[PDB]
Design a protein around this ligand. Structure first.
Ligand SMILES: *[C@@H]1O[C@H](CO)[C@@H](O[C@@H]2O[C@H](CO)[C@@H](O)[C@H](O)[C@H]2NC(C)=O)[C@H](O)[C@H]1NC(C)=O
Ligand SMILES: OC[C@H]1O[C@@H](O[C@@H]2[C@@H](O)[C@H](O)[C@@H](CO)O[C@@H]2O)[C@H](O)[C@@H](O)[C@@H]1O
Ligand SMILES: *[C@@H]1O[C@H](CO)[C@@H](O)[C@H](O)[C@H]1NC(C)=O
Ligand SMILES: *[C@@H]1O[C@H](CO)[C@@H](O)[C@H](O)[C@H]1NC(C)=O
Ligand SMILES: *[C@@H]1O[C@H](CO)[C@@H](O)[C@H](O)[C@H]1NC(C)=O
Ligand SMILES: OC[C@H]1O[C@@H](O)[C@H](O)[C@@H](O)[C@@H]1O
Length: 494
């Protein structure tokens, strides 16, 4: 089994010569993240956002006791592959006993569902959706800030992950897995009945965050109300689009309201050309920040079955990789936790605005911190190139640990986020496993919504993305290393 510090045991060219071998090492150590008090609570089956690790030792210290439906989506997607008997998912979940992987996934998902249902019972006002929650005790509570508030985006991610898991479980023909799947189907189906009432304001406007009068009141209690928080709507092509599809297919909207969803969204779907120095022009979908995380939706629905979409998103990775070469960055950018202050052991903040400003709606960006999970969209197109970029960042001081990759490093190598999260680690894992879009596509076809998806989304993308430039620009490989400035590898992983 591989050394903890395997990233620098390979050369870059060796990664490209045999991506699978390298990925096999990656999955093994990533899987160590999957432990009680590190990434989830085995008592209630619920994710934690992650955990801090000690500056010197690289051992788990201080967990994050909160999580959200977005991290749930990463865990559930992993479990969908695991229960289906994926050998790669087993290398993650149960490397020394692959046969146990399906049972492990089934067991946790059973415990998890029980917890979801206790939460629904105590907080029926959420209508079967999840706010940001505290998962450190047996029963979920909303985090303080998220009492009477629920986000559409995170829930959109979870729902299609559960959709995949159900399909995966039923595909096994194992009777107890099928029974588990049907209980999850019941949970998932309940959200269909509440989705429009909670999140659809009308005229194509979908709340980013819904304010609930009182989470203790049933959805249709005579005093219960739902209203959008401010004027922030799920109206763009990023992760929130998953929730749009949920409303369209299952929400009971009229044809006019479905048309209004896409009409209201249309101005946020924009073609722009990346062009810096000798790189480009490359036509891409304009990003929010052009953080890698914005591409999440392609993990969960079969966007890449549509060739115009596949081409536009392939271009994104031409731009993302080559942008880093031309601007001399030894990694790529995504929303991420900032460095740890070694004196306190605390993360100094969260950096949302990390991406590629010239092809972004939001041009005010912090670009001093890079993260391995930035490669997840690259991995979907070219796992060698993806893993080369991953390796380049992972070789930075303290950027591997006994639970796999570390959250983030400054590109100048003077600081590291001594932290593990689902977002910075298991996003990449889910990309290595090919997303769940195959499972989702199967179930969509069986429920006769696949054709509608293709027609609508091909129409929207083909209307905006014409005469692509830069499709001849090859993906770029890392040309700079993370500087060594005197940071010392974790004593358990060196
Ligand atoms: C991420 O952490 C860095 C420090 O490591 C922050 O950058 C510093 O910001 C302070 C206070 O605004 C300045 O006085 C320093 O000059 C900056 N230091 C460096 C090394 O650039 C950065 O603001 C943090 N970002 C977030 C979002 O937390
Ligand atoms: O706080 C609500 C919700 O915000 C989410 O942040 C969004 C981000 O993911 C998205 O890429 C951009 C552009 O649409 O908008 C928002 O910043 C965050 O991901 C969720 O976890 C939060 O619940
Ligand atoms: C959630 O609770 C409500 C009200 O208590 C109930 O009507 C509904 O069936 C519950 N949902 C699930 C999936 O059990
Ligand atoms: C919310 O509803 C519960 C159940 O009726 C009630 O106990 C509580 O006082 C209400 N909270 C507020 C802030 O009105
Ligand atoms: C950012 O997006 C909004 C919503 O579509 C748009 O109106 C605004 O002009 C965009 N800003 C830039 C700088 O592209
Ligand atoms: O889930 C990744 C990150 O999301 C951010 O929005 C939260 O502020 C962090 O606590 C968390 O680590």
């Amino acid at each position: 089994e591989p050394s903890c510090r395997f990233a620098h045991q390979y050369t870059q060219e060796q990664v490209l010569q045999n991506p699978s071998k390298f990925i096999n090492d990656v999955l093994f150590w990533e899987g160590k993240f999957h432990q009680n008090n590190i990434s989830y609570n085995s008592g209630n089956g619920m994710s934690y956002d992650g955990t801090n690790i000690d500056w010197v030792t690289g051992e788990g210290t201080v967990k994050h006791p909160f999580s959200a439906a977005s991290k749930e989506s990463l865990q559930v997607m992993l479990y969908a592959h695991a229960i289906a008997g994926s050998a790669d998912a087993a290398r993650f979940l149960s490397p020394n006993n692959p046969s146990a992987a399906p049972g492990i996934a089934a067991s946790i998902m059973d415990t998890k569902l029980q917890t979801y249902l206790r939460f629904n019972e105590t907080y029926p006002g959420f209508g079967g959706f999840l706010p940001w929650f505290t998962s450190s005790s047996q029963d979920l509570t909303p985090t303080w800030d998220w009492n009477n508030r629920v986000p559409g985006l995170d829930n959109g991610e979870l729902l299609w992950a559960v959709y995949a898991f159900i399909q995966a479980a039923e595909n096994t023909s194992n009777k107890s897995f099928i029974d588990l799947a049907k209980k999850w189907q019941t949970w998932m189906d309940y959200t269909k009945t509440t989705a429009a009432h909670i999140f659809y304001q009308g005229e194509g406007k979908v709340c980013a965050v819904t304010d609930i009068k009182n989470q203790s009141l049933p959805v249709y209690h005579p005093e219960q109300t739902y209203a959008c928080e401010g004027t922030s709507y799920l109206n763009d092509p990023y992760e929130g689009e998953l929730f749009t599809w949920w409303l369209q297919f299952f929400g009971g909207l009229s044809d006019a309201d479905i048309e209004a969803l896409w009409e209201y969204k249309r101005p946020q779907l924009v073609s722009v050309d990346y062009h810096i120095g000798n790189v480009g022009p490359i036509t891409v979908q304009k990003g929010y920040w052009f953080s890698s995380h914005e591409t999440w939706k392609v993990l969960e629905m079969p966007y890449y079955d549509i060739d115009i979409i596949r081409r536009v998103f392939q271009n994104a990775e031409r731009a993302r990789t080559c942008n880093s070469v031309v601007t001399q960055v030894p990694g790529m950018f995504a929303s991420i936790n900032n460095v740890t202050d070694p004196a306190t052991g605390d993360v100094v903040g969260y950096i949302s605005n990390a991406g590629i400003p010239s092809i972004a709606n939001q041009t005010i960006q912090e670009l001093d911190v890079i993260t391995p999970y930035s490669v997840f969209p690259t991995v979907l197109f070219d796992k060698g190139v993806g893993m080369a970029w991953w390796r380049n960042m992972a070789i930075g001081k303290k950027m591997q640990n006994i639970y796999g990759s570390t959250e983030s490093t400054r590109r100048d190598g003077t600081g590291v986020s001594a932290l593990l999260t689902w977002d910075s680690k298991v996003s990449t894992v889910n990309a290595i496993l090919g997303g769940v879009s195959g499972l989702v596509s199967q179930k969509m076809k069986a429920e006769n919504i696949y054709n509608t998806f293709v027609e609508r989304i091909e129409a929207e993308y083909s209307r905006v993305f014409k005469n692509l430039k830069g499709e001849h620009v090859p993906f770029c490989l890392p040309q700079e290393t993370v500087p060594d400035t005197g940071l010392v590898d974790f004593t358990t992983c060196n």
